[PDB]
Design a protein around this ligand. Structure first.
Ligand SMILES: NC(=O)c1ccc[n+]([C@@H]2O[C@H](COP(=O)([O-])OP(=O)(O)OC[C@H]3O[C@@H](n4cnc5c(N)ncnc54)[C@H](O)[C@@H]3O)[C@@H](O)[C@H]2O)c1
Ligand SMILES: NC(=O)c1ccc[n+]([C@@H]2O[C@H](COP(=O)([O-])OP(=O)(O)OC[C@H]3O[C@@H](n4cnc5c(N)ncnc54)[C@H](O)[C@@H]3O)[C@@H](O)[C@H]2O)c1
Ligand SMILES: NC(=O)c1ccc[n+]([C@@H]2O[C@H](COP(=O)([O-])OP(=O)(O)OC[C@H]3O[C@@H](n4cnc5c(N)ncnc54)[C@H](O)[C@@H]3O)[C@@H](O)[C@H]2O)c1
Ligand SMILES: NC(=O)c1ccc[n+]([C@@H]2O[C@H](COP(=O)([O-])OP(=O)(O)OC[C@H]3O[C@@H](n4cnc5c(N)ncnc54)[C@H](O)[C@@H]3O)[C@@H](O)[C@H]2O)c1
Ligand SMILES: Oc1cc(Cl)ccc1Oc1ccc(Cl)cc1Cl
Ligand SMILES: Oc1cc(Cl)ccc1Oc1ccc(Cl)cc1Cl
Ligand SMILES: Oc1cc(Cl)ccc1Oc1ccc(Cl)cc1Cl
Ligand SMILES: Oc1cc(Cl)ccc1Oc1ccc(Cl)cc1Cl
Lengths: 302, 303, 303, 302
């Protein structure tokens, strides 16, 4: 009864597997009585579906009481496209999309409205920076704009198409990284840039969507977590691995950051306990954000 | 769900049912915490009687239909750390007659004695004698008092409770936006002392996080007509706070009445295992007012 | 005093005498810089004629009674990096007839050719086709355009000028408050793209600071009725910008008319050896509006 | 002519020697045509006076053109006291104060008004944390309150007593440190705390003083500099020495931070070039503020 989402329905954009923050959020949302629908990137939908029906993810679905998480729908969704006229021929051609239709944001909204009705909870757990491993001086207009398009406009588009089907008192969460506010070497490709805009837009949307639909809009700035999208930067030992160590050694709380930690925080920002909370960037990072200085620097002593 | 059974909390700065302290206490209990309270001695008697009568039973009802009961109500003056710090005027002050052992060190001891190690600590108190005065008209004695009562109190409170706090425990305090941007009428260096409070939340989140594995956070709240807010500007007319609430209602993303429960629940989260990777933050619980860079109802502006 | 003799600057985004770009140029020159300009090709002709006629000579007078002369006025489209990026419609666009070599790579080359390594770089341009539209009514094509023209342009500009910039050189860009807090009517994802711009200032201050020992800063400006600001909301009536200026005048610490010189001089500092330990900052040049947490002239509120 | 302060008069609180930021600010202000008066802590006034008349500081006074800096007055000033009734008997007793009167903020304001007239420029370059080397968990009410009183209220009091004698369009600068916003280990004793309040009050004063006198109010957050007050923390190799290294190795600009660097920045914030600038915290720190991560951490590689 302190968090109780029975009755409510949630849509979680960006779940391809059990290793990202999206999975964890969906897991907790569901754990609280909500109906949870996923939006899944089409090229990877096939393998995800397999994973689920094979019983290969039955461990990662175990809710505290042994029950397994049901998903009330798993929708093809490419949040780089707002509507049909936007999808290139080479994508409709592309083998990997071959099989499913109705995967633009406008179309997924429409599918969800009539399959499930109005929703309560909207989760944006997805980014894509083609040139993430390039520093800004080496990132191209096209790679920068793609990172913006995939990782920030995607959120605005989602709100634009889901807010009309969202109940008054609904809530929406997205996910940033500290790079948005402060320099993080290695996080390139205009991703820092895009996250900064994701944060700005979390504020503007909180306003526009607060007034138009009474729907809250918040962000979590989250610490490093070895998701599959995170392992692919530098694709040996790599961006995320060093990120995890740096935070272990320098954060106020010395502990492993678990995907569920963001899961819990998301649950709060999407629950009635947060009815007065909007426009916020909430740090879920063991407190790393609060430091002005490394405590494991070579430039002092151990 | 979130489950605080087995856990004990001390909420400091509870004298009535109208405070953010009350609402927080009411939410820790409804999640199954044991809740002991801290109450400024001058008003302890009138508070004890309010509970004991039954006047607060409306305000005491939890979701399950039962009634919050407290596990001890401690006299507490957060302006004092030790009994040597209490001056003669207060020892022999008529408002403080009957009450004993209310300095921070002593309360922390009796709380250890009577209850054992706590898990949760709330700092929900403030006081600045010259709050009505702008900063250009505020004195060293009163500004320093504002810092003493509203900022340092949180430092001492952590210092003296930290040791009796379980690994993975939480402390949270309460600020107002004025700490980051100017809110007129929020005077007496309360603005100053809330910025200090926020800074200390970060610094202590480090210190207490490294030493005790305790989390430390701050909720920056929006306007609420609590007893203390009513006292600001006091005549008997539409006060500082009335205008704050009106302004927020008219300029916040969410057009809404902020209720003490709204913070109750925001805090509940912060003091719960759901927040175990959250520390050192300033969580705006203000209907989104903080995010605005411009009032919408300005007279420069059309409706 | 501060002395820019021997130094050369390229100020990008100058088509009239009403812009913040103009005022900055006018201040670099009055400190004895050589100032070459960047001008969007569609308006280059009308700009060249304005200077050449003598219509701007009022706007051209420096403190010493003389007249700013420019060391070359380059056609520049910051939406394009290379001549392969320019599409056929623009190649054969009537507004672009006569002008050649205006992509960022090419301008940086001719600037190297004609003048050598520069010391100072100003980014004073923005464009977002759907600026009148709130974000909930903004398109991917237009939001992306806003980022392309107003944010990435600064990245490319540094990328392509960095190499021809002297150790200890400066670049500065221009933002608006909306990047941090909501300013209604500032739409089309201009808000979004200014936040990106500010973030990149920090990231590039690192990157360019480590590689070139170049500084990189951002002035967050207050409202000014420049040509581009007048175009926002355009009917023929009291516009978005008129209300911005009124609001600021009524709610800023300093009750004052913000003039383009106010930024001219703030920037001058940032691009001068006085600022050699300053990099990655967002300097509010806004009569102190940014510091406020509440409008004073709200209709919730009494005069 | 780009900065030209001839005619104007400045008062610089907190100059005891040629090694602090106060000296540098005063040096540049004077360098620009201003009359510059100093407020100097009484216990150290004697030695300072000596230093100046002995010709021992004639190097540090050399302005670019070889001319030497004149000071239009050097006032006893203990900014822990607002007015005569506030000074304890043991301080009036104290040998070190024995010799000079009129050293409270109210009295120095009054002395300056009639010796020099109305002023234009006010500089607050002073702090004192009795327990700076103690972390916050170990700092006492008294030490915390003293750090607040010395380093933050001091500024409010100065504005309170100088603003009445300040010309419209005047300007005022104080000096913070990054500890105010983000955790810096070693900077204890409630100094972080006080600086946070110094920043808050720079904003509130910009408002109160903007409206009441048309006087601007700004802060510089400055990087580490081996002033004499800075050498006394840890009083061997110590807080400031490590601070200087950490910033050398981790800041966007890899260069020595010189007292003049803050001097220049101060000059700007106190000049007509800043007439639209108020309420600001201006970072003069080689860009250290902008980083979210050390680049010399043990937790990666070199
Ligand atoms: N893992 C971390 O350390 C970390 C830290 C901070 C923030 N984040 C953020 O959290 C979010 C999820 O990241 P994660 O680590 O859980 O990654 P993840 O491995 O869950 O996958 C990212 C997801 O986005 C999807 N995606 C990419 N392009 C898409 C498109 N065009 N349309 C629809 N979906 C697309 C993929 O299906 C994938 O599920 C990301 O936005 C990221 O910015 C992650
Ligand atoms: N009410 C609001 O609008 C609002 C907004 C933002 C922040 N806050 C903050 O929340 C906290 C709770 O206050 P509130 O608004 O709920 O009203 P309240 O009436 O509950 O708060 C005042 C309480 O603090 C206690 N107290 C005051 N001075 C004390 C002292 N010297 N020693 C010990 N206890 C003392 C009193 O007993 C009283 O119970 C305050 O710290 C305040 O800064 C309140
Ligand atoms: N005027 C204000 O109130 C205000 C406030 C805050 C920030 N700013 C910023 O300051 C900068 C200068 O603009 P301004 O207000 O001085 O007016 P302006 O009319 O001088 O700015 C527009 C200029 O940028 C150029 N430009 C526009 N799109 C371009 C493109 N795609 N490629 C190359 N050049 C292009 C134009 O030639 C034009 O000269 C802008 O970046 C803006 O974001 C202005
Ligand atoms: N040096 C640094 O690295 C550094 C970094 C950031 C900020 N600062 C700040 O700059 C300011 C000056 O510091 P600095 O390094 O130049 O120190 P400094 O060596 O110049 O001396 C501090 C000054 O404050 C004075 N003082 C102390 N208590 C006083 C009192 N009660 N009344 C009047 N004066 C008093 C002393 O006379 C001394 O001149 C300080 O406020 C400090 O917070 C210094
Ligand atoms: O934003 C992130 C930050 C971190 Cl530390 C780790 C992973 C993140 O997520 C991504 C990073 C790059 C790409 Cl291409 C895609 C994704 Cl989902
Ligand atoms: O901090 C606050 C902010 C607001 Cl808007 C309203 C009340 C607040 O709380 C206080 C303000 C002044 C005093 Cl003397 C005591 C308290 Cl508890
Ligand atoms: O950024 C700005 C902020 C303000 Cl208040 C006023 C003008 C601004 O500048 C622009 C805004 C929109 C477009 Cl299309 C182009 C430009 Cl140059
Ligand atoms: O604030 C400061 C920050 C830094 Cl890095 C260095 C020196 C500073 O200045 C002081 C620090 C402590 C005390 Cl007791 C007095 C002063 Cl003037």
């Amino acid at each position: 009864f302190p968090i109780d989402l029975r009755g409510q329905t949630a849509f979680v954009a960006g779940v391809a597997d059990s290793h990202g923050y999206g999975w964890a959020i969906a897991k907790h949302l569901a754990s609280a009585g909500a109906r949870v629908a996923l939006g899944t990137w089409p090229p990877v939908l096939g393998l995800f579906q397999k994973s689920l029906q094979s019983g290969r993810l039955d461990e990662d679905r175990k809710l505290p009481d042994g029950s397994l998480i049901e998903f009330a729908g798993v929708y093809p969704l490419d949040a780089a496209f707002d509507k049909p006229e936007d999808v290139p021929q080479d994508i409709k051609d592309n083998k990997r999309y071959a099989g499913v239709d109705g995967y633009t944001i406008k179309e997924v909204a429409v599918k969800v409205k009539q399959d499930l009705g109005n929703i309560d909870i909207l989760v944006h757990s997805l980014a894509n920076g083609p040139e993430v491993t390039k520093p800004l001086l080496e990132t191209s207009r096209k790679g920068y704009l793609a990172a913006s398009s995939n990782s920030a406009y995607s959120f605005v588009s989602l709100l634009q198409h889901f807010g009309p089907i969202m109940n008054e008192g609904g809530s929406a969460v997205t996910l940033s990284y500290l790079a948005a506010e402060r320099v993080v070497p290695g996080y390139g490709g205009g991703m820092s840039s895009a996250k900064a805009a994701l944060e700005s837009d979390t504020r503007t949307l909180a306003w526009e969507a607060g007034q138009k639909y009474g729907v809250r809009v918040n962000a979590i700035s989250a610490g490093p977590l070895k998701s599959r999208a995170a392992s692919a930067i530098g694709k040996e030992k790599s961006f995320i691995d060093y990120a995890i160590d740096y935070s272990y050694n320098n954060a106020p709380l010395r502990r492993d950051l678990h995907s569920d930690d963001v899961g819990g925080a998301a649950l709060f920002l999407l629950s009635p306990l947060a009815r007065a909370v909007s426009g916020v960037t909430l740090y879920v990072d063991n407190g790393l954000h609060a430091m002005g200085q490394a405590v494991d620097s070579r430039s002092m002593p151990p």
